[PDB]
Amino acid sequence: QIAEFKEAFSLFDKDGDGTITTKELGTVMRSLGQNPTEAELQDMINEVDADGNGTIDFPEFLTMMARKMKDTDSEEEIREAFRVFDKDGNGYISAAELRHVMTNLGEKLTDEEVDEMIREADIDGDGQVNYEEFVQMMTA
Amino acid sequence: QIAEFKEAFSLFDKDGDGTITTKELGTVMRSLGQNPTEAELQDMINEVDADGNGTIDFPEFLTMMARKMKDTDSEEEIREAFRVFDKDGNGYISAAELRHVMTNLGEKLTDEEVDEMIREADIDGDGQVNYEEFVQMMTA
Amino acid sequence: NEQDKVVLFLCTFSDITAFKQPIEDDSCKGWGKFARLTRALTSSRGVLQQLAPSVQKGENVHKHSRLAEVLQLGSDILPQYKQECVFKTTWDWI
Amino acid sequence: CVHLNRKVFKEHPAFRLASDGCLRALAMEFQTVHCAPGDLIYHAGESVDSLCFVVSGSLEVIQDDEVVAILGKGDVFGDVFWKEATLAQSCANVRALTYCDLHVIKRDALQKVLEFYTAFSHSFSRNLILTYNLRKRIVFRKISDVKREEEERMKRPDHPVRRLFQRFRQQ
Amino acid sequence: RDALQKVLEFYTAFSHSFSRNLILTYNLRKRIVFRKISDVKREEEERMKRPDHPVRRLFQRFRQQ
């Protein structure tokens, strides 16, 4: 979803350098049917780019995309919980991840309670918890 | 039932003109084994016919047949309801028929209530209501 | 229809946001709304207006070509919602 | 049976949270129907007792001689059983347009599996969206009927019957 | 289990001796709690590494569990 934008970014860059120039922007804007001011295009490049050299990488776009996310509050809170529970950032919550956030958060449970939460949250039987299994417990 | 009489009316007329003469009446009365007075036959023709020309059509008989109906009160009331609900007179009550008699009678219901009465009264699933489905709701 | 009755309707769609004008009730920036407009009209611009980012006047060429693709699709609206040898026997006999 | 119903299990979001034991105990219950074109599965009024997944083909849904829903590949019809726990009548005919491949499951085996796999059944309820409820009759009017109503401007005792309509108010 | 329960309901005096004598080599119901040695190797690695209120109440719900 987040990475699925950049194919149209392949339609953005005409040179093929990973750096959107002003001439490619003017070409696609004239292809859009509009005749914009190139000074305003330089303004849009300087506001969009973090490199500030007349061209921007897609990581420089990623902050503007995260600003343009503007999703729901509940999914953002649960995504924050999923990001702080997955310390590996692999989209999966290990039992060691649950034990380490039990120690770091303060709520200390026994190891059987860790495996109990793992076995109760998991449905498909993989020893780890996905985001849908996460919101299954975030619902109640 | 009402139209099923006229085959014997085919036995009534001997000429085959759709007009019962007095001579055919005298022939079938002598065939009945009785020797009636032809003046009384002219009296019966003048009392029976609406044309008043010594001969009667079957529509002139239809008023005497409706007078000689003398059916039950309940079936006559429900037949009156069926005749005033079928504005088309086709023996079937459309949903537009129910809506128009809801507007004309005064009892205004929503369109879902019209289709609710249609779906509840109908059993065989034709979108319309027959006389037996009519008396199914006229019973309760 | 086969009975020539007007039984269904077909409504085909695309995204003409970038082609006409960007108008937002609210947005983060002009570039952000412009980026959302380009990401929305992706299959319009991408797999139909292929060489059109090199050329100018896309409203005169590529948008007209997408409308003509819709016109050829209306020419292909002919299926009309309907169901769509003894010589070989005698030939094989002889 | 799991390989036979891979055409459901790899496609639907209702099944990707299931245990593999639940996958096998479901796949052992899935019949497979090869619908000929023009042949109808649920006639209007027949009992809906088996939600169907359409893995191939095209279907029409006829309510009062009118196409209400066209069902393509990956669509689910029938009736939600585990919420209702009630047998209903098919309010619509469901006919096939092409050579259709369906993977059906009757409500009894479905309820057996869902009673056994309790933690799965909630995610199943949350994820399975019926493409067409065959219980819920949909209210609509035809354009010929409103053409007749527009014609009815030319046209423009109830007490034993309107009380029955008041009985409809009591209904 | 159905035919077993039929027989054990019929042979009542046998079923007690059956319960006393039959020792299951493995209960397939009772999930056994254990940890892997890769997991405690990861925990020994976690010495290098060394908001909760909406979730820890859920853990308190685990206390309620």
Question: What is the C-alpha to C-alpha distance for residues D145 and B43, in angstroms, rounded to an integer?
Answer: 53
The answer to whether the annotation marks B13 as part of a ligand binding site is: yes
Q: Which of B121, C35, E43 is nearest to A100 (CA)?
A: E43
When divided into structural domains, chain D yields a total of 1
| Way the structure was solved | cryo-EM
Would you report the helix, strand and coil content of chain C in percent, each value rounded to 5? Answer: 45, 0, 55
Cα separations (Å) of B56 from B25, B39, D68, D69, E30?
A: 12, 17, 56, 59, 99
Burial class of residue B84 (count of CB atoms within 10 Å of its CB; 0-12, 13-18, 19+): middle
DSSP state of A5: G
Do E and D have ≥3 inter-chain CB pairs under 8 A?
Answer: no
Question: What is the C-alpha to C-alpha distance for residues B74 and B64, in angstroms, rounded to an integer?
Answer: 21
Question: What is the C-alpha to C-alpha distance for residues A105 and E51, in angstroms, rounded to an integer?
Answer: 8
**Cα D126 vs. chain centroid, distance in angstroms?**
17
Cα angle C37, C38, C44 (rounded to 5 degrees) comes to 105
* Matching residue, tokens 């007792």: D49
* CB contact at 8 A, A62 and A71: no
Tokens of A93: 């919550």
> Which residues of C fall within a CB distance of 8 Å from A44?
30-31, 34
CB atoms within 10 A of CB A10: 9
Residue D31's domain spans which residues? 1-133
* CB contact at 8 A, A50 and A64: no
* CB contact at 8 A, B84 and D159: no
Q: Is D39 on the interface with B (CB under 8 A)?
A: no
* CB contact at 8 A, B48 and B61: yes
**Cα D171 vs. chain centroid, distance in angstroms?**
27
Question: What is the C-alpha to C-alpha distance for residues D8 and D11, in angstroms, rounded to an integer?
Answer: 5
Q: Is B73 on the interface with D (CB under 8 A)?
A: no
CB within 8 Å: D123 and A136: yes
Name which of C27, C38, C63 is nearest A33 (Cβ-Cβ).
C63
Fold entry, domain A5-68: Recoverin; domain 1 (1.10.238)
Cα angle A43, A48, A49 (rounded to 5 degrees) comes to 105
* CB contact at 8 A, D80 and D130: yes
Question: What is the C-alpha to C-alpha distance for residues E38 and B23, in angstroms, rounded to an integer?
Answer: 121
**Can you list the pairs that B99-106 forms with residues at least 24 positions away whose Cβ atoms lie under 8 Å?**
B99/D149, B100/D149, B100/D152, B100/D155, B101/D158, B102/D165, B105/D157, B105/D158, B105/D161, B105/D162, B106/D158, B106/D162
Question: What is the C-alpha to C-alpha distance for residues E28 and E30, in angstroms, rounded to an integer?
Answer: 6
Tokens of C12: 């085909």
CATH number, position D106? 2.60.120.10
Interface test with E, best of A77, A107, A136 (most E CBs within 10 A): A107
Task: Give B65-76 as a DSSP string.
Answer: HHHTT---HHHH
* CB contact at 8 A, D120 and D18: yes
Question: What is the C-alpha to C-alpha distance for residues D133 and D76, in angstroms, rounded to an integer?
Answer: 9
Question: What is the C-alpha to C-alpha distance for residues D161 and B107, in angstroms, rounded to an integer?
Answer: 10
- What values do phi and psi take at D139, rounded to 5? -85, 130
Q: Which of A69, A129, D118 is nearest to A138 (CA)?
A: A129
Half-sphere exposure of B88 (CA within 13 A, CB side): 12
Half-sphere exposure of D87 (CA within 13 A, CB side): 8
* CB contact at 8 A, D99 and D37: yes
In a domain, D56, yes or no: yes
Q: Evaluate the CA torsion angle B98, B103, B104, B105 in order and state its sign.
A: positive
Would you report the helix, strand and coil content of chain A in percent, each value rounded to 5? Answer: 60, 0, 40
Tokens of B127: 């979108």
Residues at the binding site of A are: 13, 15, 17, 19, 24, 49, 51, 53, 55, 60, 86, 88, 90, 92, 97, 122, 124, 126, 128, 133
Tokens of E45: 């690695």
* CB contact at 8 A, A62 and A51: no
CA dihedral E26, E27, E30, E33 (to 10 degrees): 0
CB within 8 Å: E54 and A81: yes
CB atoms within 10 A of CB D120: 22
The answer to whether the annotation marks B47 as part of a ligand binding site is: no
Residue B49 DSSP SS3: coil
Interface of D with C in 5-64 (CB under 8 A): 37-38
> Which residues of A fall within a CB distance of 8 Å from D120?
123
Would you report the helix, strand and coil content of chain D in percent, each value rounded to 5? Answer: 35, 25, 40
Cα angle A109, A115, A121 (rounded to 5 degrees) comes to 105
Do D and A have ≥3 inter-chain CB pairs under 8 A?
Answer: yes
The answer to whether the annotation marks B122 as part of a ligand binding site is: yes
In a domain, D159, yes or no: no
Tokens of B51: 């044309």
Strands D75-78 and D132-133: parallel
Name which of A120, A125, A132 is nearest D123 (Cβ-Cβ).
A132
